Structure 1
Amino acid sequence: FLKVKNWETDVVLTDTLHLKSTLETGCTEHICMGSIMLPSVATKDQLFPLAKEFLDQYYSSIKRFGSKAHMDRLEEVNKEIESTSTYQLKDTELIYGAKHAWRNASRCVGRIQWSKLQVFDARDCTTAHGMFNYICNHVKYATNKGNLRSAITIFPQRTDGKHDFRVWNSQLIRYAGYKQPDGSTLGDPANVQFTEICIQQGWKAPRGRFDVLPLLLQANGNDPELFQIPPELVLEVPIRHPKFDWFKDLGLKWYGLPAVSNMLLEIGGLEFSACPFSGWYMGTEIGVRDYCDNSRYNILEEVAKKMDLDMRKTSSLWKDQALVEINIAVLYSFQSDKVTIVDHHSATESFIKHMENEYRCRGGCPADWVWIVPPMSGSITPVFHQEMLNYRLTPSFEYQPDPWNTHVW
């Protein structure tokens, strides 16, 4: 029953939820892995404990723990794991599972919204064309004319392992990356291997900067197939600044919809290898990481120039200065277009408030400080001063290998 303190407000919360934690962290009594980025076929023996554990908490959630329906659904799933060495979630259990996978995502600062999640059941999907259609409806719904809405589309669960449904894209909407004949990079350098894979599968690249990549969709473990998201469904925000009119000349833009498509959704021991989920952006994801990472668009160089800054001396903080302007611009541009976005101040404040709610009516809130604290201005946001216990609850979103390494073509 551990205590977590906030050192800006002196507020203490007692965490008991970590007792329900099952998985492991990577840390031991003698080493802390809290800054390691990635911390690391299922049988029927292992499957019923996970099913039972999940069904227990689901039925405890609808205020019917131990009722007759709980007992029968338990025996129903036990018997289905006998006959088929797997089982199928009810629609309701799927929606519960998915919302709590988000709820339990310790690295997500946006979880105050976790109960407002739109779950699209795509478990009847059979082909990549079907996936494409399901993803298009996801994009359109989640974008909602810029009034973004949280959503997840859940494709058939893994069965044997060689019939996985996979979205090969790391996110549904990402810009292309092209290495250049002079060794530099165009577009997004993070996607240069993926952009070449699309080209190997036949993508005709408009070798420019902000080229929306096509979907690479693998259905039932079959080879994956290319589809272009109808561009009218890809909402983009041209980035302008409220003071610097030359900022439009940068010609920057970003897409409104952050939609992670490479993670694995675990519910009651069932594994959903394709489960694209989307919300809305926190400003810093674009302004700081996408734009100013050295291995991403890396625009601190150009933006500092146009600001009339001292780029000779490291200690002039020209980088810090141009980083703020960039993030004022990302926010202003999204807001002026009525496209949902949250600033790292409002997002972190809501997460503290979210944390307070979880400690009250749930006994805790697993949280990964290394990821919750924004990548600029860390200590002028309240999460910097908030001790956080990280632990792995299930249902959960898990990392999984990139499919081009595991697939058998």
Structure 2
Amino acid sequence: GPKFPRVKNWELGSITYDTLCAQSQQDGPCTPRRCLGSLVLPRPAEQLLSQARDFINQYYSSIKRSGSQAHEERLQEVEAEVASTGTYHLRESELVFGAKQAWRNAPRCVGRIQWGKLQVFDARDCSSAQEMFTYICNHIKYATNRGNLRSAITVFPQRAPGRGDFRIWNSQLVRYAGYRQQDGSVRGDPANVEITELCIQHGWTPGNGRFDVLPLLLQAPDEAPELFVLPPELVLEVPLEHPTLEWFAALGLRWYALPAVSNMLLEIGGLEFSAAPFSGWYMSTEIGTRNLCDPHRYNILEDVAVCMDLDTRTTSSLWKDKAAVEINLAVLHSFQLAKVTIVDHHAATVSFMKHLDNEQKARGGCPADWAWIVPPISGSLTPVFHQEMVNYILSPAFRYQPDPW
């Protein structure tokens, strides 16, 4: 057969080959000796120019002007700029393409069917932390759009030689506080203890609830971060209830509408955008299973199961399985009622199978991380479970980056 990974779908019996992987220039963590595919983190002039060149070619290819005068002129322009400044700058429509291409390239995102329909806010003029705040507020208002959510990303200035970075300290634009107690436990979200304690250290007067929205710690170059409270009206939340278990509302659970990742680095043609928050809309298991039920997050599974009156003293009653299902139903139902966009794991994964089909035709494959694409309840009930996937790093890219503290 072809000298390319063969990829099989075990439900349908169908076969493809991934030719796209040939274009990866960046090693992941696996070797022939051992697979490290389940780990979460995978821890200069000539280097830059070759990455810049690569990207500019991708751009010209995407507008069908590869080999052209305009193309060879853009390349010259970029070697000359690097020649005398050590860096270069992207045209506007280049950044729009890079950003969409980084999303499209993200192996862990199941929402990629929407990749072409992404609003890109250029914020590369931003010169202060106050100005970040405004740009961020504007993003939240656009993206939230009173519950009818819209994909977006706001791109702050790139890293620059010698000068410090623009950074958002928060991992999301909207996260709930985590308060370490005298008895060792935690009130709120245990995932957020450190950022909470940093916000206090920097002068935030802390609340004491389970669902206190955190302030933003925003940092402009070579400056201490500054603290900004989001105005409550901008932060859409949804109270949780259940369609038939009338008591479920009594639990006082709630989640926010807008999932916005704010500590990832966006890399395009070697340029590094250290602050570039993006947002989409939730898939229901992000909230109902991971956020609410992880042992190390809100961990509410026993609580709900006791209210449902299940036998929590024995694994084989499947009490965890039942309660998680009903928590997920409540998330779905409560967002529908409140007219806030959300997608269930069945719909989401169907749409991702379609994306895979599209990309197979458009590019000869799709980098995908199986363990993240498959949801954390009802795995094999979704079609992605039965699809082999090939995982690799393409550029443009979103990458993790070390916390700034």
Which residue matches 1:67? 68
Q: 2:73, 2:252 → 1: CA distance? A: 60
TM-score (norm 1): 0.97
1:17 is aligned to 2:8 = no
Which residue matches 1:32? 35
Q: 2:163, 2:211 → 1: CA distance? A: 34
Shift in Å, 1:204: 0.5
Shift in Å, 1:86: 0.3
Shift in Å, 1:180: 1.1
Which residue matches 2:280? 279
Q: 1:73, 1:204 → 2: CA distance? A: 51
Which residue matches 1:407? none
Amino acid in the other structure paired with 2:150: R
- What secondary structure is seen at the aligned counterpart in 2 of 1:265? strand
Shift in Å, 1:221: 3.3
Amino acid in the other structure paired with 1:330: V
Which residue matches 1:353? 354
1:272-328 CA-partner distances (Å, limit 9, x unpaired):
000100000000000000000001000001100110101111111101100000000
- What secondary structure is seen at the aligned counterpart in 2 of 1:240? coil
Question: In angstroms, what is the RMSD of aligned CA positions?
Answer: 0.8
1:3 is aligned to 2:6 = yes
When residues 162 and 84 of structure 1 are mapped into structure 2, their CA distance, relative to the original with a 3 A threshold, is closer
Q: 1:269, 1:253 → 2: CA distance? A: 41
Q: 1:98, 1:290 → 2: CA distance? A: 27
Which residue matches 1:193? 194
Q: 2:151, 2:379 → 1: CA distance? A: 26
TM-score (norm 2): 0.98
Superposed, 1:42-53 pairs within 5 Å as: 43-53=44-54
- What secondary structure is seen at the aligned counterpart in 1 of 2:90? coil
Superposed, 1:56-135 pairs within 5 Å as: 56-135=57-136
Q: 2:100, 2:376 → 1: CA distance? A: 26
- What secondary structure is seen at the aligned counterpart in 2 of 1:303? helix
Which residue matches 1:229? 230
Superposed, 1:230-269 pairs within 5 Å as: 230-269=231-270
Which residue matches 2:214? 213
Shift in Å, 1:220: 1.4
Shift in Å, 1:46: 1.0
Which residue matches 2:368? 367
Instruction: Tell me which stretches of 4 or more aligned residues in structure 1 moved more than 6 Å.
Output: none
Q: 1:307, 1:242 → 2: CA distance? A: 14
1:143-179 CA-partner distances (Å, limit 9, x unpaired):
0110000000111001136510001000000000001
Q: 2:144, 2:263 → 1: CA distance? A: 19
Amino acid in the other structure paired with 2:242: H
Shift in Å, 1:9: 1.1
1:181 is aligned to 2:174 = no
Amino acid in the other structure paired with 1:27: C
Amino acid in the other structure paired with 2:32: E
- What secondary structure is seen at the aligned counterpart in 2 of 1:291? helix
Superposed, 1:370-389 pairs within 5 Å as: 370-389=371-390
Amino acid in the other structure paired with 1:243: T
1:37-65 CA-partner distances (Å, limit 9, x unpaired):
1012xx11211100000000110000111
Q: 1:221, 1:396 → 2: CA distance? A: 25
Q: 1:161, 1:122 → 2: CA distance? A: 21
When residues 34 and 161 of structure 1 are mapped into structure 2, their CA distance, relative to the original with a 3 A threshold, is farther
Q: 2:308, 2:175 → 1: CA distance? A: 28
Unaligned runs of 5+ in 2: none
Q: 1:86, 1:126 → 2: CA distance? A: 19
Unaligned runs of 5+ in 1: 405-409
1:358-406 CA-partner distances (Å, limit 9, x unpaired):
01111110000011100111000001110000000000000100111xx
Amino acid in the other structure paired with 2:403: D
User: Percent identity among equivalent residues?
Assistant: 68
- What secondary structure is seen at the aligned counterpart in 2 of 1:266? strand
- What secondary structure is seen at the aligned counterpart in 1 of 2:347? helix
1:74-116 CA-partner distances (Å, limit 9, x unpaired):
1001100011110000000000000000000001000000111
The number of aligned residues is 402
Amino acid in the other structure paired with 2:257: G
